[PDB]
Scaffold this motif. Sequence first.
Motif, PDB file in Angstrom:
ATOM      1  N   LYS B   1       0.831  -1.197   0.000  1.00  0.00           N
ATOM      2  CA  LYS B   1       0.000   0.000   0.000  1.00  0.00           C
ATOM      3  C   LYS B   1       0.868   1.251   0.000  1.00  0.00           C
ATOM      4  CE  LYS B   1      -2.951  -0.481   3.356  1.00  0.00           C
ATOM      5  NZ  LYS B   1      -3.393  -1.269   4.538  1.00  0.00           N
ATOM      6  N   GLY B   2       0.848   1.978   1.115  1.00  0.00           N
ATOM      7  CA  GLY B   2       1.693   3.138   1.277  1.00  0.00           C
ATOM      8  C   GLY B   2       3.100   2.765   1.699  1.00  0.00           C
ATOM      9  N   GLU B   3       3.932   3.792   1.845  1.00  0.00           N
ATOM     10  CA  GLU B   3       5.312   3.627   2.275  1.00  0.00           C
ATOM     11  C   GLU B   3       5.534   4.419   3.553  1.00  0.00           C
ATOM     12  OE1 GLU B   3       7.752   4.020  -1.538  1.00  0.00           O
ATOM     13  OE2 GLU B   3       6.339   5.685  -1.757  1.00  0.00           O
ATOM     14  N   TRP B   4       6.212   3.803   4.519  1.00  0.00           N
ATOM     15  CA  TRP B   4       6.560   4.499   5.749  1.00  0.00           C
ATOM     16  C   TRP B   4       7.758   5.417   5.579  1.00  0.00           C
ATOM     17  CZ3 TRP B   4      10.889   4.465   8.957  1.00  0.00           C
ATOM     18  CH2 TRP B   4      11.912   3.589   8.585  1.00  0.00           C
ATOM     19  N   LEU B   5       8.485   5.304   4.473  1.00  0.00           N
ATOM     20  CA  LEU B   5       9.609   6.186   4.194  1.00  0.00           C
ATOM     21  C   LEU B   5       9.822   6.276   2.689  1.00  0.00           C
ATOM     22  CD1 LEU B   5      12.162   7.490   6.049  1.00  0.00           C
ATOM     23  CD2 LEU B   5      13.364   5.793   4.680  1.00  0.00           C
ATOM     24  N   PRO B   6       9.482   7.402   2.064  1.00  0.00           N
ATOM     25  CA  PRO B   6       9.701   7.535   0.619  1.00  0.00           C
ATOM     26  C   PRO B   6      11.170   7.368   0.264  1.00  0.00           C
ATOM     27  CG  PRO B   6       8.244   9.258   1.417  1.00  0.00           C
ATOM     28  CD  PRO B   6       8.788   8.570   2.630  1.00  0.00           C
ATOM     29  N   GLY B   7      11.416   6.734  -0.879  1.00  0.00           N
ATOM     30  CA  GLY B   7      12.763   6.431  -1.306  1.00  0.00           C
ATOM     31  C   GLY B   7      13.343   5.148  -0.757  1.00  0.00           C
ATOM     32  N   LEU B   8      12.538   4.318  -0.098  1.00  0.00           N
ATOM     33  CA  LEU B   8      12.984   3.046   0.452  1.00  0.00           C
ATOM     34  C   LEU B   8      12.112   1.931  -0.104  1.00  0.00           C
ATOM     35  CD1 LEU B   8      14.390   2.340   3.884  1.00  0.00           C
ATOM     36  CD2 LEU B   8      12.494   0.892   3.164  1.00  0.00           C
ATOM     37  N   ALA B   9      12.735   0.805  -0.440  1.00  0.00           N
ATOM     38  CA  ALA B   9      12.011  -0.322  -1.008  1.00  0.00           C
ATOM     39  C   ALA B   9      11.473  -1.228   0.092  1.00  0.00           C
ATOM     40  CB  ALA B   9      12.915  -1.120  -1.947  1.00  0.00           C
ATOM     41  N   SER B  10      10.222  -1.651  -0.065  1.00  0.00           N
ATOM     42  CA  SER B  10       9.588  -2.498   0.931  1.00  0.00           C
ATOM     43  C   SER B  10      10.186  -3.905   0.900  1.00  0.00           C
ATOM     44  CB  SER B  10       8.084  -2.571   0.688  1.00  0.00           C
ATOM     45  OG  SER B  10       7.500  -1.281   0.703  1.00  0.00           O
ATOM     46  N   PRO B  11      10.196  -4.597   2.037  1.00  0.00           N
ATOM     47  CA  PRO B  11      10.665  -5.985   2.048  1.00  0.00           C
ATOM     48  C   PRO B  11       9.738  -6.894   1.258  1.00  0.00           C
ATOM     49  CG  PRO B  11      10.732  -5.034   4.247  1.00  0.00           C
ATOM     50  CD  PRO B  11       9.940  -4.093   3.396  1.00  0.00           C
ATOM     51  N   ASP B  12      10.308  -7.997   0.766  1.00  0.00           N
ATOM     52  CA  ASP B  12       9.564  -8.887  -0.119  1.00  0.00           C
ATOM     53  C   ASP B  12       8.467  -9.642   0.624  1.00  0.00           C
ATOM     54  OD1 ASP B  12      11.693  -9.938   1.268  1.00  0.00           O
ATOM     55  OD2 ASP B  12      11.994 -11.607  -0.125  1.00  0.00           O
ATOM     56  N   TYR B  13       8.743 -10.086   1.853  1.00  0.00           N
ATOM     57  CA  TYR B  13       7.774 -10.915   2.565  1.00  0.00           C
ATOM     58  C   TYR B  13       6.512 -10.140   2.921  1.00  0.00           C
ATOM     59  CZ  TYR B  13      11.140  -8.924   5.868  1.00  0.00           C
ATOM     60  OH  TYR B  13      12.018  -8.095   6.523  1.00  0.00           O
ATOM     61  N   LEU B  14       6.613  -8.823   3.080  1.00  0.00           N
ATOM     62  CA  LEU B  14       5.443  -7.977   3.290  1.00  0.00           C
ATOM     63  C   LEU B  14       4.876  -7.608   1.923  1.00  0.00           C
ATOM     64  CD1 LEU B  14       7.155  -5.683   5.932  1.00  0.00           C
ATOM     65  CD2 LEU B  14       5.630  -7.588   6.444  1.00  0.00           C
ATOM     66  N   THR B  15       3.767  -8.244   1.549  1.00  0.00           N
ATOM     67  CA  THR B  15       3.185  -8.092   0.221  1.00  0.00           C
ATOM     68  C   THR B  15       1.928  -7.233   0.218  1.00  0.00           C
ATOM     69  OG1 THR B  15       2.149  -9.297  -1.603  1.00  0.00           O
ATOM     70  CG2 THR B  15       2.031 -10.280   0.591  1.00  0.00           C
ATOM     71  N   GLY B  16       1.598  -6.594   1.337  1.00  0.00           N
ATOM     72  CA  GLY B  16       0.424  -5.752   1.407  1.00  0.00           C
ATOM     73  C   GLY B  16      -0.891  -6.489   1.522  1.00  0.00           C
ATOM     74  N   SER B  17      -0.867  -7.814   1.682  1.00  0.00           N
ATOM     75  CA  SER B  17      -2.109  -8.559   1.855  1.00  0.00           C
ATOM     76  C   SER B  17      -2.663  -8.383   3.262  1.00  0.00           C
ATOM     77  CB  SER B  17      -1.881 -10.038   1.551  1.00  0.00           C
ATOM     78  OG  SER B  17      -0.927 -10.594   2.435  1.00  0.00           O
ATOM     79  N   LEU B  18      -1.785  -8.307   4.258  1.00  0.00           N
ATOM     80  CA  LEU B  18      -2.220  -8.140   5.636  1.00  0.00           C
ATOM     81  C   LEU B  18      -2.812  -6.752   5.852  1.00  0.00           C
ATOM     82  CD1 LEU B  18       0.620  -9.879   7.673  1.00  0.00           C
ATOM     83  CD2 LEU B  18      -1.670 -10.724   7.135  1.00  0.00           C
ATOM     84  N   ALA B  19      -3.770  -6.674   6.770  1.00  0.00           N
ATOM     85  CA  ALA B  19      -4.379  -5.396   7.101  1.00  0.00           C
ATOM     86  C   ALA B  19      -3.364  -4.483   7.775  1.00  0.00           C
ATOM     87  CB  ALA B  19      -5.589  -5.601   8.010  1.00  0.00           C
ATOM     88  N   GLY B  20      -3.399  -3.206   7.410  1.00  0.00           N
ATOM     89  CA  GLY B  20      -2.481  -2.235   7.980  1.00  0.00           C
ATOM     90  C   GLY B  20      -1.028  -2.478   7.639  1.00  0.00           C
ATOM     91  N   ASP B  21      -0.733  -2.781   6.380  1.00  0.00           N
ATOM     92  CA  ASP B  21       0.624  -3.069   5.938  1.00  0.00           C
ATOM     93  C   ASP B  21       1.206  -1.814   5.300  1.00  0.00           C
ATOM     94  OD1 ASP B  21       2.278  -5.870   4.435  1.00  0.00           O
ATOM     95  OD2 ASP B  21       2.869  -3.777   4.210  1.00  0.00           O
ATOM     96  N   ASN B  22       2.281  -1.293   5.890  1.00  0.00           N
ATOM     97  CA  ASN B  22       3.015  -0.169   5.325  1.00  0.00           C
ATOM     98  C   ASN B  22       4.472  -0.513   5.046  1.00  0.00           C
ATOM     99  OD1 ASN B  22       0.670   1.477   5.619  1.00  0.00           O
ATOM    100  ND2 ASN B  22       1.230   1.859   7.756  1.00  0.00           N
ATOM    101  N   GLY B  23       4.849  -1.781   5.166  1.00  0.00           N
ATOM    102  CA  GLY B  23       6.216  -2.197   4.908  1.00  0.00           C
ATOM    103  C   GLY B  23       7.232  -1.650   5.885  1.00  0.00           C
ATOM    104  N   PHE B  24       6.903  -1.628   7.174  1.00  0.00           N
ATOM    105  CA  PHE B  24       7.794  -1.098   8.204  1.00  0.00           C
ATOM    106  C   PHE B  24       8.391  -2.267   8.977  1.00  0.00           C
ATOM    107  CE2 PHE B  24       8.261   0.526  12.649  1.00  0.00           C
ATOM    108  CZ  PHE B  24       9.411   1.247  12.416  1.00  0.00           C
ATOM    109  N   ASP B  25       9.597  -2.665   8.596  1.00  0.00           N
ATOM    110  CA  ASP B  25      10.326  -3.697   9.319  1.00  0.00           C
ATOM    111  C   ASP B  25      11.825  -3.496   9.126  1.00  0.00           C
ATOM    112  OD1 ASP B  25      10.908  -5.891  10.842  1.00  0.00           O
ATOM    113  OD2 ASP B  25      10.404  -7.364   9.296  1.00  0.00           O
ATOM    114  N   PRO B  26      12.393  -2.393   9.622  1.00  0.00           N
ATOM    115  CA  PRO B  26      13.830  -2.160   9.409  1.00  0.00           C
ATOM    116  C   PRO B  26      14.719  -3.228  10.018  1.00  0.00           C
ATOM    117  CG  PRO B  26      12.961  -0.648  11.044  1.00  0.00           C
ATOM    118  CD  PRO B  26      11.780  -1.330  10.434  1.00  0.00           C
TER     119      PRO B  26
END
Lengths: 42, 197, 11, 203, 152
Positions: B1-26
């Motif tokens: 869905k959205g990005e928690w930090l513009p200019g950063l690529a989301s991790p592969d295992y987080l595919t946005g299927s889960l509710a409230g997914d912003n790809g935040f797992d540094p």
Amino acid sequence: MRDLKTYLSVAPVISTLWFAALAGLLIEINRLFPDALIFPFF
Amino acid sequence: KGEWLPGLASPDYLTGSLAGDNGFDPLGLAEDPENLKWFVQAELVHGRWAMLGVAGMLLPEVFTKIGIINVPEWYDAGKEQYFASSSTLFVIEFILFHYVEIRRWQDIKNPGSVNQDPIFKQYSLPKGEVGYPGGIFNPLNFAPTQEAKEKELANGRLAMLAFLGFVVQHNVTGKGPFENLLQHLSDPWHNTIVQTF
Amino acid sequence: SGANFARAFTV
Amino acid sequence: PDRPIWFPGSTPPEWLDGSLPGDFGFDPLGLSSDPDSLKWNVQAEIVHCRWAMLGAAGIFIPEFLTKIGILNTPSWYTAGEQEYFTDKTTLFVVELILIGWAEGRRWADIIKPGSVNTDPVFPNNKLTGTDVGYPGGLWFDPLGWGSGSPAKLKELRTKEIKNGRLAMLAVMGAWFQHIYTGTGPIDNLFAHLADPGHATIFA
Amino acid sequence: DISGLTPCKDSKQFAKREKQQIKKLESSLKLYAPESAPALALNAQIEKTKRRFDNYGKYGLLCGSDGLPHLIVNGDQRHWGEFITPGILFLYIAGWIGWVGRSYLIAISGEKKPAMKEIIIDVPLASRIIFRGFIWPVAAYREFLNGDLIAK
Ligand code: CLA
Ligand SMILES: CC(/C=C/C=C(C)/C=C/[C@@]12O[C@]1(C)C[C@@H](O)CC2(C)C)=C\C=C\C=C(C)\C=C\C=C(C)\C=C\[C@@]12O[C@]1(C)C[C@@H](O)CC2(C)C
Ligand SMILES: CC(=C/C=C\C=C(C)\C=C\C=C(C)\C=C\[C@@]12O[C@]1(C)C[C@@H](O)CC2(C)C)/C=C/C=C(C)/C=C/[C@@]12O[C@]1(C)C[C@@H](O)CC2(C)C
């Protein structure tokens, strides 16, 4: 510049910088807090 | 869905299927799927508790300040005397919570296994997803859409932040939270964290 | 001689 | 190719072709041999030029005005010591937050060239600039002078870079003059102009 | 109180030792001029000694018969910060180090010649790995439950 960074990444130089930084941190902590035999925060 | 930090690529295992997914797992905790499922259930229940806790420690203070009821602060509730000793209440809570939490753990381990009522065999829970039992837990029968789940997750995260702020800002300053807000509103530039302690 | 000793304890 | 260089008769380094704005082939130490090093150095130099230029203006305008009777602004060196309406730490924290947001946006642009050109709150706004370090758009280019022919753009960038370099040198000179001598820079300038023979650093 | 010990804010040998040290310092202080730098240094030393003694008294330690503080590693609730509170902290930090190192090794096991990466460390990957140890207990517990901690 590539080889300068490569040399600065070698084991002795990285080790001495790391140990110098750690020793500086320990020295500054011991200066700020003079002496302590127990942990009184909690 | 959205990005928690513009200019950063989301991790592969987080595919946005889960509710409230912003790809935040540094720090990369949810690399294994089993860890992902466990942490999903944790983020649900942890936080569903926190919202109730935050409301309970905040709203009575406001009501007392405006003056309808006189209730002790959330800290001094334990020091107050009740009808029964704290030990018996603790034991009752321990037994009941043991039962309900073991039921929930059994459901998580083996989905669709503890739906049947042990006492009355006829009653049962309709099949669904783990973490959202539905059925008798949903008397008004609201729609379990994805938007409601996202709203619940966002409110839970805000509750986490609110509870941590409450606890730490009481620890540094003994004054209560609502009184702290009122003090800050008295004069913002002289009553912030930096100005006082 | 005092200033030389004090140079170490300036801070 | 045959542009003027810092040291006439010498050979410029191979990694300074001459396409960059404000180039003179001055890099004896070889600090920008790698490409990413070149990009980072270019961005750092541009930002330093802008900041030092603003600093030089804000130091040398009020002091010169205070030399005349028009204003009464105190000296730049003692500005931090003078009292204000709030303690210095609160102002520092607020400034830290406000500048940190913009610096994060700029850093995200530097890492990914075209990812922060859209307004997150109202998505109708946009930034039309298509070069790192030159945001463009209405917020930063309201007059539209930024867009133009490549030659005119190169000339303008060269003027900006040279002014920035002069500003850095002037700011450092003002700081060193204040610490070494202990008087306002305009006072030193007037003292030197009155007696160019003996009024030097040697004194 | 415990094992026939005396509280450190009530014993007399503590005060006697403090007086002895202060007198020893003041004997050397008299030699120099009162305004000279050695006088300032010795005054700072005296202030440090007094502050240390006051802090030791206020912290609730237990001096012995001869006058020195004694540490209790038993597990009593009045000495949580004597051994148990620092020790846990150490473990945390220590675990951090170990975890980080282990991760880095795995991160170089894929390549054909890991020896070059062992004798010449790389900074980018190491910096990526360094901050993952802040949550080492959780990752370690999850790996232990999964079973990837032990080779087979
Ligand atoms: C890199 C991490 C690392 C890890 C996780 C371990 C793990 C272990 N060590 Mg080994 N060891 C290491 C490095 C490491 N070692 C090094 C560098 C040496 C040579 C000095 C040894 C020599 C050694 C001996 C002689 C023994 C062990 C034993 C043990 C085991 C018991 C714990 C203990 O006694 O520690 C002992 C720890 C030490 C004596 C010193 C370790 C401190 C090093 C310097 C820290 C690691 C830093 C490293 C440079 C980080 C680089 C990563 C970075 C690039 C990102 C445990 C499996 C014991 C055993 O066999 O148990 C079954 C034992 O007898 N180790
Ligand atoms: C449950 C909770 C609080 C519950 C409180 C309750 C029930 C309170 C109850 C009471 O008040 C009442 C009602 C009345 C009072 O009389 C009594 C008490 C008992 C006081 C807080 C959780 C609080 C939980 C918090 C703050 C968790 C924060 C987690 C963070 C920030 C994690 C971040 C990251 O993990 C990510 C997401 C991804 C990684 O890659 C990177 C990192 C950085 C590791
Ligand atoms: C950004 C900057 C740079 C300065 C000064 C910057 C300087 C002097 C930089 C010098 C760099 C040199 C010489 C580099 C040389 C080489 O790198 C080359 C180019 C190529 C290599 O091959 C060879 C070598 C030799 C390595 C200065 C900024 C100053 C600012 C914002 C000042 C602001 C304020 O004044 C105001 C407005 C008002 C005051 O009340 C407060 C302050 C805060 C004081």
